Each structure stands twice: as C-alpha cells, then as structure tokens.
Amino acid sequence: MTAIEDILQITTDPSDTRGYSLLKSEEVPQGSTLGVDFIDTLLLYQLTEDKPFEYLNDCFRRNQQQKRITKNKPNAESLHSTFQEIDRLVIGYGVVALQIENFCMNGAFINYITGIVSNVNSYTDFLSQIIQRAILEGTALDLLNAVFPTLLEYCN
C-alpha cells in the first residue's frame, strides 16, 4: 500500500513531513486503504495539479528501481501483483497521455518532447515500453503522425 504512495507520490490524508501531491477530491478515494483496483482512479486525478509525461516517466523509473529494492526483500512475492499492475496501468496511461493532445490539460506534446530531447537518457527506456504497448493494440499509426511533427515544429 505505502509502496504505491511513494511510487505515485500521493497519499490520502496527506499533508505530513513531505510535499506529496494532495489527494482530491472524490468521495470514494478518501478511505485509508488502497489495493489492486485503485491505481486507475488515482492516475485519473493526477493526469487531469505541469509535466505529466515527465511525472509518469519518473513514476515508472521509481517502479523499476523498486524492483531492485524489493527483489532482495523477504516479501517480494506479495507485491509482485502490485508491481505487475503498476507496470500495466502507468504504461497504459503514459501512452494515453501521448495518444491524444487533449488528455492531459496541463502540459502539451511540445512541452513533453522538449524535455524528452533535453534528457532523453531517462525517457529512452520508458518510450520503448510505450511503443511495445501501442504496437499490439494497433492504434499507433496516428501517434506516429502526432509525435514526429511535434518535434518538427519544436526544431522549426
């Protein structure tokens, strides 16, 4: 549970000892209990609080680092489903954020790709899983038409 709270930098209460993003404001996301069927709801608030793509890539980076952290822990099998569902949903929502222009209301494709070019050494892996998820779905032809002209206009 608390693994998700630091991974997604979100807590219910939440204001104590850290600047984790406040949890607002729907009635259901108020109980002091998280689980398998909650990751979707939390991401729907975080994406729609300026760089949602950078935030999702950082969350994926922390999720990956926590794999190394937790594999050497006695309870790596209990949270295995948690990590699998995080890798599913965070990746799905990262693709969605770069699937249509009007999904994330703060931060545009030009803003994402600008930082991507600035620090591509950190996005070069997450974008791989992005394309891997997109390909088998088949809805990637439009995104090949959406992402490239963005960098084109940036460079122009």
Curated annotation (Swiss-Prot):
User: What disulfide bonds does the UniProt entry report for this chain?
Assistant: none
Q: Can you say what this protein is called?
A: E4 ubiquitin-protein ligase UFD2
Gene source species: Saccharomyces cerevisiae (strain ATCC 204508 / S288c)
Localization, per the record, is: Cytoplasm; Nucleus
Taxonomy-wise, where does this protein's organism fall, top ranks first?
Eukaryota, Fungi, Dikarya, Ascomycota, Saccharomycotina
What more the UniProt record tells us is: Present with 2600 molecules/cell in log phase SD medium.
Q: What is known of its domains?
A: The U-box domain is required for the ubiquitin protein ligase activity.
Q: What does this protein do?
A: E4 ubiquitin chain-elongation enzyme specifically involved in polyubiquitin chain assembly. Binds to CDC48 and elongates mono- and diubiquitinated ERAD substrates presented by the UFD1-NPL4-CDC48/p97 (UNC) AAA ATPase complex to a chain length of 4 to 6 ubiquitin moieties. Delivers these polyubiquitinated substrates to RAD23 and DSK2, which target them to the proteasome. Has E3 ubiquitin-protein ligase activity, accepting ubiquitin from its cognate E2 ubiquitin-conjugating enzyme UBC4. Enhances ubiquitination at 'Lys-48', but not at 'Lys-29' of the Ub moiety.
Member of which family?
Belongs to the ubiquitin conjugation factor E4 family.
Q: How does it assemble?
A: Interacts with CDC48. Interacts with the ubiquitin-like domain of RAD23 and DSK2. Interacts with PEX29.
